[PDB]
Amino acid sequence: SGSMKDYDELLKYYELHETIGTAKVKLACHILTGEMVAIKIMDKNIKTEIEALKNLRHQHICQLYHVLETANKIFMVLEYCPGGELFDYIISQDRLSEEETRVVFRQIVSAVAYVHSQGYAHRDLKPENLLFDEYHKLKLIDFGLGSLAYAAPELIQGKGSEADVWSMGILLYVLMCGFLPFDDDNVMALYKKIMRGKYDVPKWLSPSSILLLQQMLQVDPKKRISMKNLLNHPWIMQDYNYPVEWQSKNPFIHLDDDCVTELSVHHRNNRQTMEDLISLWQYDHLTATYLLLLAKKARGKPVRLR
Ligand SMILES: CC1(C)C(=O)N([C@H]2CCc3c(O)cccc32)c2nc(Nc3cccc(CN4CCCC4)c3)ncc21
């Protein structure tokens, strides 16, 4: 409602800053560690879609620190990405070079690789759900599930890991062309173009780009390249010479000694109790404190609390 009494349980742990997004989205501060976060504040009147994010932990998937649920609201503390929408960056520069695109597109593959490993399909890969962090590294976000220009042909018919490969195809195209491969003023026509499968091939595109694009943008799902072959594809490996490392560097089971020690001093508990406690991953204040500590370390900053 209009009520400000919900923000009470929140402001225990967090100190608010400006609004964005108006779900309303506020930039906040985690009091104990001082790290910036981003709170998705939702007014009841998708529960499971949260449980999804609880199991996903990966350096290009937007991290979930804390869930606060009252009878009047639900708050979602998430990694704050300063760099903004990938969409805005593409328009910002008209179009990306192959070398740059490759840097970005490798991060997108790593994430989508990973999500699939956990048996989830993102089903909404558009450059509006890829945001830059301060490192200018990419972070995937919306697991709510148009958007139509990114829909695989099979989804338009009715009838998938493979549909994600189609959208990554549309991504690669836009990244390197700066406009969509299938686009129109008239929706029914846009349906049509997509289903046909024919797109322009701008002069500035290398044949490697054209090859990969062709293998990803297959109108038939089975003829579409597979996640396996994509990871080490010759285009993907071009300046790197190692395949995409999609493996999570942020585990549920490997806890951090440096981080647990500091937390032990604050809660006045021993290393065993604390570790057992953190390992429950309740996504309460403890989960947010440990995770935000890891990040606080990942900046090479002091592993201290307030
Ligand atoms: C918690 C979460 C996941 C979220 O729900 N949003 C919303 C907020 C606006 C927005 C968006 O533009 C695209 C996707 C998601 C969201 C988020 N948005 C950011 N960072 C961000 C987004 C757009 C623009 C900018 C940069 N501008 C605005 C602030 C100064 C310059 C940053 N991080 C996390 C989220």
Residue numbers in the entry: -2 to 19, 23 to 45, 54 to 153, 170 to 183, 187 to 333
Sentences reproduced from the published study:
Maternal embryonic leucine zipper kinase (MELK) is a serine/threonine kinase in the adenosine monophosphate-activated protein kinase (AMPK)-related kinase family, and was first identified as a maternal gene in mouse eggs and preimplantation embryos. Out of all of these potential roles, MELK is best characterized as a mitotic kinase, as its expression pattern highly correlates with other mitotic genes. At the protein level, MELK is hyperphosphorylated, and reaches its maximal abundance and kinase activity during M phase in both Xenopus embryos and human cancer cell lines. Due to the potential oncogenic role of MELK, several groups have developed MELK inhibitors to validate its potential as a drug target.
Lastly, MRT199665, a pan-AMPK-related kinase inhibitor, showed reasonable potency against MELK (IC50 = 29 nM). To better understand the mode of inhibitor binding, we determined crystal structures of MELK in complex with HTH-01-091 and MRT199665. The MRT199665 structure also revealed a type I binding mode. The pyrimidine and aniline nitrogen atoms from the core form dual hydrogen bonds with the backbone NH and carbonyl group of Cys89 in the hinge. Toward the deep pocket, MRT199665 hydrogen bonds with Lys40, while the dimethyl group abuts the gatekeeper L86, promoting a relatively open conformation of the N-lobe. The hydroxy group of the hydroxydihydroindene group forms a hydrogen bond with Glu93, restricting the plane of the indene orthogonoal to the rest of the molecule. The indene group is in van der Waals contact with Gly18 and Val25, but intervening residues in the P-loop are largely disordered. Specifically, the pyrrolopyrimidine MRT199665 induced MELK degradation most efficiently. We postulate that the induced conformation upon binding of MRT199665 is more poised for the degradation response.
